[PDB]
């Protein structure tokens, strides 16, 4: 019974051996008094040959796709090799064939991928309703095995660096603010509920208070958000925390971990260290806090070059950002880019073509008086097209930032490879507008920069935080920060945020007390593992790297779960349905 | 700033080096113009010495227990070595000392364990309320680090054997029967709920149907049970499933996995293979389906020796089980054992002492007529005490089985080491009594023994299942079985269990359809990881091997979760509180 080899493992070196294989029939071909069966298992395909003189011929004649069988035979060299199958040089002459399970016709084909051919994927609702058949496809199994390899690589590296894996609670306390929590009724007392964790944040910080120098966990997180932007009700994160560290210790450890993961999983060598850009530098050069560095097209400030002369729009604005495109755009291409600029509420997009010794179209006449100085600042050459956005420094950068991205598509620029970078020095507080007090941009426990400590009172506007974001190809894959370990500083901060000393004792009471027993300096980070895997695989959605995901409504077509429960089961919990 | 070494890592080989250490003050001793501070971190303790001539003396004079500090000094040999501390041969002459965080007085001491001293534990409610301080104790950290090592060992071994780790859903469908499910309200539609998983059972079987030859996962399971028998609302299991296997392939793989874990984690060598006992053999020899093999005291059937003579009680009973204790019991010891026997509803405990050439006390007079035959069957010698339990074969065995265990305590027998064993050949159906149809003893998907297939109709009484339990020192740590992969056989089984073809389509509908697309033979097992860890560590409860557990009422003293939620938050979910 026991198989001798995986079907897709057979090679020219097995010629002459007697083998026993078990798997699925990928395809059957009757070539006239000769039946060929392509047997499949996780490692690949192998051609089986049944001749009329073989005792297995009768059974080979009744087999259909997806039937599970056990085959016995002699491995022999193929009269003609198939250059695209790892087992292409051999075939198995059958001596026996037995059916272990029959199968009805699948709603969609799963055989093409295994031949190296392109597949026609069925609608996603069908794939999800029959996920166990979708998971038989080569590409899906490659994604799941890659996810295994990545997590194993993470364990090998962190175990080697002294990190202790700690499992955190799933039934915790609900919090009045943040994101909406998923709740769990406490049977023994109506009105009491557990909440599923949005993140292990407080627990990993308490593990640092406990003296576990360094921790990690592949943690499942749950957030009941009105998400349609390709997000799942629950997702996976690599969670990590360390003690007695400064920002640089965290970044260096993560760069080395990430290079290890890519080397082991994809066999790709990443250059270290990763570039590091401050929030301000990223906004000015790329118009975004999550820059895509796979192409250039850097933004240039040219506002100074315009106030000595005089072109209305270009001077009432404190900033004039320019972008030099290596192509002569058409009127339709310009109009499309202008739409993008306006979406990010910018009054308009100005343009001009760069010809030999002069400009053409758009605002060309206003550029001639500064031609020389402009060509240097922008480094534009004949044939290029200049685009401008004038207005508030933040609006101009953000708007042109969006144009730069859309421009990469129209021009069909080559965006390949993996470009990682750290964005650091973010501000501590967010846009609280003009009525009253500020709010946090990261999380209440994020440490403000030490040298900026004093400014915390007189000008909390430009006080930076010790926070960092990890971005890959224009996408945020992770983020973290150095935490506040001083109970008094935490308060001083809570003074600014305007959170009452009665509200703190309600939403963070147990944690604030922990800080009074000697908390060491500490900090960490969390990676969106599903998102990282989707980018590593070039998948269009994180649903391609999760075995059994939910659809866009948060429902599960396979199990039909969000389902009704017996009225008495709810009554047992002391609950009744109403409206919402 | 950065430390040069972990405090507890210093050795005689570091003498002469300048070091920077960071940690907690475990204890301070003022020896008169000389202050000694024991600095602690995850690796252990180091003695720091501050002299009046040192710039660090002033600070050393104000430090208290649990304060976090950074110390700089020169390592030097100790004038007197401390033989019980890994760093006992050295000490650090301080040149500098800085306070990073002060700490108030802890509710209970955490310093003794680090010195090797016996530790005085506080009430469990206090330990849980201040779990981050409890976790500073040496024994708690040893437990957590051991848990890390065991899980890493499992990943190494299974990855090497070709298993693919797959993460399963946490939000699934609720099922009308089994154990009570924890529910999660579906916001977008009142009356709809997700259920937390009781086990990944159906998902790992669908992963076999998908063609992933072998899978594993360290899975979190949730069961809303009225548990007080040292059980948590959620627990962890090592979950594993394999394709194209027979019972023996699963047992062998698990024995090698377990031997690997014990060797890597504890440095203990387990003898393979593990003994295998059938359910019947285990019940007859030890009176239990989870036998403790750390000692003998095997049960003996002696009922046959009594029907030719005639002692009332000993004949109306189909069974008379005997146990020979290597000690002359007192009347109090006998009375205590009789209580245990009655607990497991047995009418009573008969006894007699074995003297030289005869019996004494109890039912001695009725034993004399069979003395020779009895002494052979029981192998009893002078000085031993014979115990008997007469009645239904099942009651006698179970009752005396309990007596054997309690007897091990009274006699103070030595029960040390780790004795693993497999209990196999369990029956397929349970005690459905005399009114109607049977019920399952394992799970609906457990495969009945093949050779017993026919008896499934005419005498389903003695049809065995392909199920197996893994036992360690009298405790069940795991269990699994070969699954049914034939949709027709599954039905045939459902015929016996009496489950309607409409109820199946409601509780297993999606899964029954999966079996029709070609399911391969498969089977697996699940280990109660928390229970295994508690046994490996000699812990009295699984709460000692879980970082943040719940108390006996399923509540969390640390966070105070089960908590009430705003009336409007519930209304948002379309729910209102009632009673229970």
PDB file of C-alpha atoms in Angstrom, chain B residues 79-188:
ATOM      1  CA  UNK B  79      37.275  36.653  47.042  1.00  0.00           C
ATOM      2  CA  UNK B  80      34.751  33.909  47.893  1.00  0.00           C
ATOM      3  CA  UNK B  81      32.804  31.904  45.246  1.00  0.00           C
ATOM      4  CA  UNK B  82      29.056  31.296  45.566  1.00  0.00           C
ATOM      5  CA  UNK B  83      28.457  27.624  44.538  1.00  0.00           C
ATOM      6  CA  UNK B  84      24.857  27.835  43.294  1.00  0.00           C
ATOM      7  CA  UNK B  85      24.940  30.837  40.978  1.00  0.00           C
ATOM      8  CA  UNK B  86      26.304  30.419  37.460  1.00  0.00           C
ATOM      9  CA  UNK B  87      28.143  33.735  37.904  1.00  0.00           C
ATOM     10  CA  UNK B  88      29.212  32.851  41.438  1.00  0.00           C
ATOM     11  CA  UNK B  89      32.954  33.143  40.785  1.00  0.00           C
ATOM     12  CA  UNK B  90      32.857  36.793  39.729  1.00  0.00           C
ATOM     13  CA  UNK B  91      31.444  40.196  40.639  1.00  0.00           C
ATOM     14  CA  UNK B  92      31.384  43.641  39.037  1.00  0.00           C
ATOM     15  CA  UNK B  93      33.214  46.605  40.539  1.00  0.00           C
ATOM     16  CA  UNK B  94      31.012  49.574  39.704  1.00  0.00           C
ATOM     17  CA  UNK B  95      32.303  52.700  38.006  1.00  0.00           C
ATOM     18  CA  UNK B  96      28.826  54.040  37.141  1.00  0.00           C
ATOM     19  CA  UNK B  97      25.153  53.350  37.948  1.00  0.00           C
ATOM     20  CA  UNK B  98      22.087  55.044  36.506  1.00  0.00           C
ATOM     21  CA  UNK B  99      18.366  54.660  37.338  1.00  0.00           C
ATOM     22  CA  UNK B 100      16.169  54.096  34.290  1.00  0.00           C
ATOM     23  CA  UNK B 101      12.943  53.526  36.237  1.00  0.00           C
ATOM     24  CA  UNK B 102      11.825  53.423  39.848  1.00  0.00           C
ATOM     25  CA  UNK B 103       9.332  50.860  41.125  1.00  0.00           C
ATOM     26  CA  UNK B 104       6.892  50.718  43.990  1.00  0.00           C
ATOM     27  CA  UNK B 105       6.748  47.725  46.367  1.00  0.00           C
ATOM     28  CA  UNK B 106       5.443  44.535  44.652  1.00  0.00           C
ATOM     29  CA  UNK B 107       2.362  42.826  46.257  1.00  0.00           C
ATOM     30  CA  UNK B 108       4.430  39.602  46.614  1.00  0.00           C
ATOM     31  CA  UNK B 109       8.174  38.721  46.308  1.00  0.00           C
ATOM     32  CA  UNK B 110       9.772  37.637  43.051  1.00  0.00           C
ATOM     33  CA  UNK B 111      13.432  37.464  44.156  1.00  0.00           C
ATOM     34  CA  UNK B 112      13.883  34.113  45.896  1.00  0.00           C
ATOM     35  CA  UNK B 113      13.631  31.803  42.892  1.00  0.00           C
ATOM     36  CA  UNK B 114      16.546  33.527  41.192  1.00  0.00           C
ATOM     37  CA  UNK B 115      18.758  32.614  44.165  1.00  0.00           C
ATOM     38  CA  UNK B 116      17.667  28.973  44.089  1.00  0.00           C
ATOM     39  CA  UNK B 117      15.715  29.470  47.316  1.00  0.00           C
ATOM     40  CA  UNK B 118      12.308  27.925  47.966  1.00  0.00           C
ATOM     41  CA  UNK B 119       9.642  30.320  46.761  1.00  0.00           C
ATOM     42  CA  UNK B 120       6.530  31.272  48.709  1.00  0.00           C
ATOM     43  CA  UNK B 121       3.606  31.550  46.289  1.00  0.00           C
ATOM     44  CA  UNK B 122       0.764  33.996  46.887  1.00  0.00           C
ATOM     45  CA  UNK B 123      -2.908  33.300  46.239  1.00  0.00           C
ATOM     46  CA  UNK B 124      -3.782  32.550  42.643  1.00  0.00           C
ATOM     47  CA  UNK B 125      -6.136  35.510  42.434  1.00  0.00           C
ATOM     48  CA  UNK B 126      -3.276  37.872  43.337  1.00  0.00           C
ATOM     49  CA  UNK B 127      -0.855  36.203  40.927  1.00  0.00           C
ATOM     50  CA  UNK B 128      -3.416  36.577  38.129  1.00  0.00           C
ATOM     51  CA  UNK B 129      -4.378  40.165  38.965  1.00  0.00           C
ATOM     52  CA  UNK B 130      -0.652  41.084  38.813  1.00  0.00           C
ATOM     53  CA  UNK B 131       0.397  38.504  36.223  1.00  0.00           C
ATOM     54  CA  UNK B 132       3.195  40.724  34.820  1.00  0.00           C
ATOM     55  CA  UNK B 133       4.930  40.564  38.201  1.00  0.00           C
ATOM     56  CA  UNK B 134       4.256  36.838  38.617  1.00  0.00           C
ATOM     57  CA  UNK B 135       5.968  36.292  35.250  1.00  0.00           C
ATOM     58  CA  UNK B 136       9.230  37.828  36.661  1.00  0.00           C
ATOM     59  CA  UNK B 137       9.725  34.682  38.758  1.00  0.00           C
ATOM     60  CA  UNK B 138      12.332  32.199  37.604  1.00  0.00           C
ATOM     61  CA  UNK B 139       9.949  29.214  37.479  1.00  0.00           C
ATOM     62  CA  UNK B 140       7.366  31.038  35.377  1.00  0.00           C
ATOM     63  CA  UNK B 141      10.003  32.159  32.854  1.00  0.00           C
ATOM     64  CA  UNK B 142      11.424  28.630  32.693  1.00  0.00           C
ATOM     65  CA  UNK B 143       7.913  27.364  31.845  1.00  0.00           C
ATOM     66  CA  UNK B 144       7.417  29.905  29.052  1.00  0.00           C
ATOM     67  CA  UNK B 145      10.863  29.302  27.564  1.00  0.00           C
ATOM     68  CA  UNK B 146      10.234  25.561  27.629  1.00  0.00           C
ATOM     69  CA  UNK B 147       6.938  26.109  25.778  1.00  0.00           C
ATOM     70  CA  UNK B 148       8.878  28.072  23.104  1.00  0.00           C
ATOM     71  CA  UNK B 149      11.450  25.241  22.742  1.00  0.00           C
ATOM     72  CA  UNK B 150       8.780  22.552  22.421  1.00  0.00           C
ATOM     73  CA  UNK B 151       6.889  24.430  19.673  1.00  0.00           C
ATOM     74  CA  UNK B 152      10.125  25.217  17.803  1.00  0.00           C
ATOM     75  CA  UNK B 153      11.104  21.482  18.050  1.00  0.00           C
ATOM     76  CA  UNK B 154       7.725  20.534  16.546  1.00  0.00           C
ATOM     77  CA  UNK B 155       8.204  22.963  13.651  1.00  0.00           C
ATOM     78  CA  UNK B 156      11.728  21.604  12.923  1.00  0.00           C
ATOM     79  CA  UNK B 157      10.686  17.914  12.879  1.00  0.00           C
ATOM     80  CA  UNK B 158       7.427  18.278  10.938  1.00  0.00           C
ATOM     81  CA  UNK B 159       8.990  20.650   8.383  1.00  0.00           C
ATOM     82  CA  UNK B 160      11.708  18.034   7.841  1.00  0.00           C
ATOM     83  CA  UNK B 161       9.080  15.312   7.352  1.00  0.00           C
ATOM     84  CA  UNK B 162       7.299  17.338   4.659  1.00  0.00           C
ATOM     85  CA  UNK B 163       4.339  18.740   6.570  1.00  0.00           C
ATOM     86  CA  UNK B 164       2.863  22.074   5.534  1.00  0.00           C
ATOM     87  CA  UNK B 165       1.646  24.375   8.312  1.00  0.00           C
ATOM     88  CA  UNK B 166      -1.782  25.789   7.388  1.00  0.00           C
ATOM     89  CA  UNK B 167      -3.675  28.505   9.367  1.00  0.00           C
ATOM     90  CA  UNK B 168      -7.425  27.752   9.815  1.00  0.00           C
ATOM     91  CA  UNK B 169     -10.407  30.178  10.256  1.00  0.00           C
ATOM     92  CA  UNK B 170     -11.381  31.592  13.650  1.00  0.00           C
ATOM     93  CA  UNK B 171     -14.792  32.851  12.558  1.00  0.00           C
ATOM     94  CA  UNK B 172     -16.796  29.812  11.437  1.00  0.00           C
ATOM     95  CA  UNK B 173     -20.246  28.240  11.491  1.00  0.00           C
ATOM     96  CA  UNK B 174     -22.054  27.258  14.681  1.00  0.00           C
ATOM     97  CA  UNK B 175     -23.210  23.640  15.038  1.00  0.00           C
ATOM     98  CA  UNK B 176     -26.408  22.459  16.841  1.00  0.00           C
ATOM     99  CA  UNK B 177     -24.570  19.648  18.650  1.00  0.00           C
ATOM    100  CA  UNK B 178     -21.261  18.764  20.264  1.00  0.00           C
ATOM    101  CA  UNK B 179     -20.130  21.203  22.931  1.00  0.00           C
ATOM    102  CA  UNK B 180     -21.509  24.696  23.404  1.00  0.00           C
ATOM    103  CA  UNK B 181     -20.062  27.270  20.998  1.00  0.00           C
ATOM    104  CA  UNK B 182     -18.856  30.773  21.864  1.00  0.00           C
ATOM    105  CA  UNK B 183     -20.711  33.088  19.482  1.00  0.00           C
ATOM    106  CA  UNK B 184     -19.776  36.318  17.721  1.00  0.00           C
ATOM    107  CA  UNK B 185     -22.553  38.698  16.496  1.00  0.00           C
ATOM    108  CA  UNK B 186     -22.625  39.614  12.801  1.00  0.00           C
ATOM    109  CA  UNK B 187     -23.216  43.383  12.757  1.00  0.00           C
ATOM    110  CA  UNK B 188     -24.605  43.744   9.238  1.00  0.00           C
TER     111      UNK B 188
END
